[PDB]
Amino acid sequence: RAEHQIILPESHLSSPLVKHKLLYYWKLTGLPLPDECDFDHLILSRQWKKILESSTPDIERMIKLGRSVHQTLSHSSKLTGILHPRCLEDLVGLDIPDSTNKFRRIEKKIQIHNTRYGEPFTRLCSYVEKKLLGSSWTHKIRRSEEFDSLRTDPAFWFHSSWSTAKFAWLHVKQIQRHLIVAARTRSASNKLVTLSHRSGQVFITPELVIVTHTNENKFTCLSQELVLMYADMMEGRDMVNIISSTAVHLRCLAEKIDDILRLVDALARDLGNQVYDVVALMEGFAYGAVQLLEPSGTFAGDFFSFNLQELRDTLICLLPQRIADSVTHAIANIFSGLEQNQAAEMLCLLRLWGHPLLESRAAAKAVRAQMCAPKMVDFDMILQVLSFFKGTIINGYRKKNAGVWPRVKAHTIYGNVIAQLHADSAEISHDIMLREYKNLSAIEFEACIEYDPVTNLSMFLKDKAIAHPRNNWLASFRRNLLSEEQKKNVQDSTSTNRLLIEFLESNDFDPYKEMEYLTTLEYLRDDSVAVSYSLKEIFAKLTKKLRNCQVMAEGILADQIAPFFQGNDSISLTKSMLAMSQLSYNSNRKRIKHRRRVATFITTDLQKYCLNWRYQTIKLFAHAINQLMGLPHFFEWIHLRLMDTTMFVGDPFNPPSDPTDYDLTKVPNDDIYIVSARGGIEGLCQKLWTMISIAAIQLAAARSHCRVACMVQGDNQVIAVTREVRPDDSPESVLTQLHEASDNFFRELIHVNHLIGHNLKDRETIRSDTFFIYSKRIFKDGAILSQVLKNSSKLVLVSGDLSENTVMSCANISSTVARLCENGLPKDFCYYLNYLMSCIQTYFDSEFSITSNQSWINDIPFIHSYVLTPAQLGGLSNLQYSRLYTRNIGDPGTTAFAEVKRLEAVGLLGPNIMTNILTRPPGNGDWASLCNDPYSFNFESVASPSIVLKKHTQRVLFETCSNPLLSGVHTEDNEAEEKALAEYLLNQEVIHPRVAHAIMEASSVGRRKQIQGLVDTTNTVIKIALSRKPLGIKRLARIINYSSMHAMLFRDDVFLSNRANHPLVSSDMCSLALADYARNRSWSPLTGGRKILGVSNPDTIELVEGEILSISGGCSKCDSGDEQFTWFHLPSNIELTDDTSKNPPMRVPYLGAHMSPHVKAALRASSVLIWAYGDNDINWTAALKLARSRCNISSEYLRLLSPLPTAGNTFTPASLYRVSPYVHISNDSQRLFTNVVYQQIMLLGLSLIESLFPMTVTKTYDEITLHLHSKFSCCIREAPVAVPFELTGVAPDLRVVASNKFMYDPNPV
Amino acid sequence: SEIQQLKTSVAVMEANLGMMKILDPGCANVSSLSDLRAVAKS
Amino acid sequence: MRSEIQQLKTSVAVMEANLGMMKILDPGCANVSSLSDLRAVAKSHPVLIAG
Amino acid sequence: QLKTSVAVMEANLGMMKILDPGCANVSSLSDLRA
Amino acid sequence: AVMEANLGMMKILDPGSSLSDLRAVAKSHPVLIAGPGDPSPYVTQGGEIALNKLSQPVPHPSDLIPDIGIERDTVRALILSRPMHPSSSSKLLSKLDSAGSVEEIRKIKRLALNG
């Protein structure tokens, strides 16, 4: 069949490693188990004499596999059954010569790719660098030796250490995925592939892979997602080897990494599964080697010595003492001698041995030891934290509501100090919060906050699992493994147990009646509530009503109460964190009362944070928020429910080991159970806990008499303790005051967390004068510290599971290579690296496929010109050369034609391809396709499989939507309204796709698209919606054959064509003339000859013609009559190391109401519609009829509320910031772009500045000045004449329901 | 006066005894919209 | 004056009777609570004690 | 009056610790509801 | 006055290492049972409760109760990784293998971090 080739097996590890799945399939064959599984609690208790008589195919494959494996081993010795991770070192050296010779066929073609095209890549990179840096820098344009090592050794992926095992495990992985796909079909094919490696064999089935070593007479068994873990770690550590041995500032790491890998492999043979207690310390050794480089003598080598002592203490319990000493010495010599970036690069050693095998019993023991423990918290410290909690609430409400306190009960205002602040409504200071805490903690509020239960609506549309209730909890496990009276307590489940689908189908959903599950205490009478815990190393599974109330409570806190505490989001988190390490000592030392403030940093992680909160600690805080909302009982629900319920760690292969467990209220506080838990669950009730943590941090600040800038997202807290000094104050005094302030604050933070029941350590928390740690990135002296090797470990070779998609795989390669280029790599190296890895990708999909292409896969110029042509035009390349310098904001079509023009000029891409793109036959095309996706060409293309499956599940899930919230989302004529609106907006005298995209996005049509795009279409949701409604025959053949159709469409349209009807424009014109010609020709069957305009933007590299000035100054452009440029200056003699006594001042570089949002969207549509087409009565009638779909305003309130007509139609940093915080920007002599274009020029200039200094450079020596001249460009055009007119025709009806708060606003504004 | 300070020192006693009472999970039907002196005096 | 002193004495007399009923721990563990206090309390609508 | 109030303060407010005797043993949920 | 007639102190021994200083610095508190359960495994004959580092009562208080390899490896890491003149770094590495105690390694650690 063909339905089974849609949702493929996963090619990468997305799940934990359950031990008893592996041991189920191990026991199901007749092989001996490992010797640490002789007294196992689940294996010795199941009734295997009935399981093995099921005669399912899943058991017959295992029995035939055991007769295959047992026949090859011998009876002269003992067959051993070594379990992961005790077989890391043997599977590390796995060497199948049948996969080596199958990857050498790819290597043989990549070497021809280099020897035919490597010299035009050199010509391209030198061309673009000579254009952007001028011909006065032309004695400094050499290719980097990263690029030259990539140019002499094309098979970097094939000739490293770890490459043979990478070949072997990728071939084993693709064979097993093919066998799973074949085993979906009910057939009788031989589902057993036997490979032969160096001294042994490999047996592959859809469930197990068995590796047998015949001289040692041993074997190991690996489950479905354990061969994925081995394949992932092999290509990860291989790519880490490649990048660390090519890059010059990383070559000392490479040997170290091999050492630190192989040593720990040798530990895994006799530590076993506890070797991941060693691996977990490796992160610490990367944080302590940064703290070796302190400016003072304090803090240096404290966390390093702590982790070295912890490593000795974990080793001496399992190893002999001598081997523990020698291994500790080896770990100490690996992480010593590193730079500031090379120490942060060793954070790649985390996922590089993979993951342990998990079980439910040990996880449940680890949870019971801390969540069922007794606690004793201090009442007076709860009063102090509650004082700062309520004072922060009062000050935040005062700031939000224009100087008014919350509605406080008048008889609860004690003393004369708070009673005086109440009359003035004055902002309460932290010193009054500490002094008057007995009077401020005892204050009560009244209902003065109008909340909203359903606000986000994306949190109710998540694919979260729902636990089926506690009379059916034995449906959590696989029915094959239950006992005979445990099978009688399992019922059928009509539900899907997903939050999304059971939210859509739940009619009579009233949020204010769903909150009565908690305010009326009916969640606590309810004897169907079950909580299920999950295997991990952050997630639980609640029932339907309780999950609804948890989502509501989180939304209400994050919407109303949480911004009172400021939470202390991508550019604004590299401006609040990059400016937070500007306060460090080494950031302002040339500058060095109350004049200049400095800070020293404390990154703390609390021991077992979420499951040490008790009801006795959180009750008064929840009480305060309940009084402030008007709720009798809302925000303390989790502790009261978990005290009264029993929960279990749920896993389908981990049943209860006692076969007589039927009722949860009668199982002991034992095997998988946590009976009457007293702590909290992670993620649940997170906002309240973050607010209590902020209140404790500000309390510790006030109790130690200092100011503090914190940032806390749960157990990860970062505090900058601050101290204000003089410019003429000595540096020794500044360091002494910072050390005393950090000591006093850290003691008070220890003290106020110990008394409310929490532990942050004296030694595990990293205190530092220099760096802090946020989102696992190290921020150090106003700079982000590099992580190229982490991104190298994810440079992998299959992406996604929805088909055999090569375009999305090459797109993931391009995004990872761009992220490598952001962490500081040569541009030419990353560009030619993406070419070579995309060729590896496109040859790995003709071979090694688990599911025609014989004509074009042996065509080397086709594969070249197909991986190098941009994806906007039909090729595979999602990395233009301009993406190496800056972000892709701008027009994708002009950047596409600009890259094609550069590649044609330097000799890479042929002359035929340009004229064949220009003479390309047009596609189907709609007005709706031009409105929904502007910047787009009407070329014949195949739709992406992920877009098709996502859109199919969004259309299928909303067919059975029935709740009163979001009732008008799925209408029967939304596509007719979409076509009518797009034909009204676009089919005018002047065609504007971008303003029509803005109008339709601001109307109710785009609101329906925006609501339907919020649903979580994961693989399980797509399987459900394809079971409820099949996909078809034409669309499904386009899903399965997507890559072959995409490649043959490139081959037919633009690679192999005659095109005797030669176009008007030639290949030498500007790229926006080219993109305008391609749009005006491609949309010509739809449009009819009119000019699609208002779309194109210039490419930033093609626009400017840069120049670096000489020593005397003066540019060859401004000597030739040029005045339009941006000016970039870098001061001389800048240190990039710790000696920052003579650096120039560092600053943050350049990076980039009171109404309902329905009225905002309506007024935005009004502003865009009047700005773009004209300002008279017909345009205002159309603007009224479009704004009337989202709100209930009249005609006269449009004209006095619409904004003025304008052009408005760290997780991943933009770069490292080493020499860009010193550059000075003057956009003064350029007056044409004073807008998006000058943003592009400024970002291109900063990337060209920081491109001049590789990571091997720590000192500048001269002054650098750029003039980005853009006057004598072919791509300069004056803005046209905006000609107003009347919109012919009438606007569509755009019907709307009035009951939706999510699509409509009935209040007359 | 000292009596006016004893009033506001005696009042936070009941406001803290009501706090100690509502920390008990057996006081889970005490609605939050209630005076803590009144919870203490009951 | 004297009336406020009488109300202070009466309020402290209420406080000593309230501290006589709380479950203060002593060696011997006489006044403990079970998990059935919450179960008997949750069977009704949450009550208002204010005044 | 000034002495018994501070005697209630020192043993009521400043010195008061709050015990949650969590069920760190092996017993079922219906055994804890007894 | 009449205050100690009802509130029984319980002699809490927070470690804010032997049993003597735990008994010596141990303030007495009136602890108040709020949660359900039995607190009897955590008190001791004499009325004393020992708390953990997480403010957890412990069953018996004795749960609450150098090296040269680590101290030489860390000072090698400080000499190797900090900026230092290469003759002086080799001189500090020269008189470090000749050490024989925890003392005179600390002299090099305060000799390396101070220059």
PDB file of C-alpha atoms in Angstrom, chain C residues 2-34:
ATOM      1  CA  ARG C   2      -9.566  52.091  80.021  1.00  0.00           C
ATOM      2  CA  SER C   3     -12.076  50.647  77.544  1.00  0.00           C
ATOM      3  CA  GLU C   4      -9.326  50.068  74.977  1.00  0.00           C
ATOM      4  CA  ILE C   5      -7.295  48.344  77.709  1.00  0.00           C
ATOM      5  CA  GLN C   6     -10.316  46.109  78.380  1.00  0.00           C
ATOM      6  CA  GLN C   7     -10.580  45.206  74.685  1.00  0.00           C
ATOM      7  CA  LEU C   8      -6.828  44.481  74.609  1.00  0.00           C
ATOM      8  CA  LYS C   9      -7.175  42.137  77.603  1.00  0.00           C
ATOM      9  CA  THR C  10     -10.194  40.434  76.004  1.00  0.00           C
ATOM     10  CA  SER C  11      -8.384  40.038  72.663  1.00  0.00           C
ATOM     11  CA  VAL C  12      -5.320  38.494  74.343  1.00  0.00           C
ATOM     12  CA  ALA C  13      -7.746  36.203  76.215  1.00  0.00           C
ATOM     13  CA  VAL C  14      -9.063  35.132  72.804  1.00  0.00           C
ATOM     14  CA  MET C  15      -5.488  34.587  71.536  1.00  0.00           C
ATOM     15  CA  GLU C  16      -4.556  32.300  74.420  1.00  0.00           C
ATOM     16  CA  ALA C  17      -7.654  30.182  73.775  1.00  0.00           C
ATOM     17  CA  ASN C  18      -6.781  29.968  70.081  1.00  0.00           C
ATOM     18  CA  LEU C  19      -3.201  28.916  70.851  1.00  0.00           C
ATOM     19  CA  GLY C  20      -4.656  26.312  73.195  1.00  0.00           C
ATOM     20  CA  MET C  21      -6.290  24.562  70.239  1.00  0.00           C
ATOM     21  CA  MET C  22      -3.480  24.587  67.671  1.00  0.00           C
ATOM     22  CA  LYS C  23      -1.452  21.446  67.027  1.00  0.00           C
ATOM     23  CA  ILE C  24       1.771  22.450  68.737  1.00  0.00           C
ATOM     24  CA  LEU C  25       4.266  19.592  68.671  1.00  0.00           C
ATOM     25  CA  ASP C  26       5.463  18.029  71.929  1.00  0.00           C
ATOM     26  CA  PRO C  27       7.527  14.880  72.571  1.00  0.00           C
ATOM     27  CA  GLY C  28       4.855  12.205  72.387  1.00  0.00           C
ATOM     28  CA  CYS C  29       2.951  13.393  69.285  1.00  0.00           C
ATOM     29  CA  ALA C  30      -0.564  13.474  70.709  1.00  0.00           C
ATOM     30  CA  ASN C  31      -2.390  15.904  68.389  1.00  0.00           C
ATOM     31  CA  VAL C  32      -1.673  14.739  64.850  1.00  0.00           C
ATOM     32  CA  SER C  33      -3.846  15.052  61.758  1.00  0.00           C
ATOM     33  CA  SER C  34      -4.712  12.449  59.161  1.00  0.00           C
TER      34      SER C  34
END
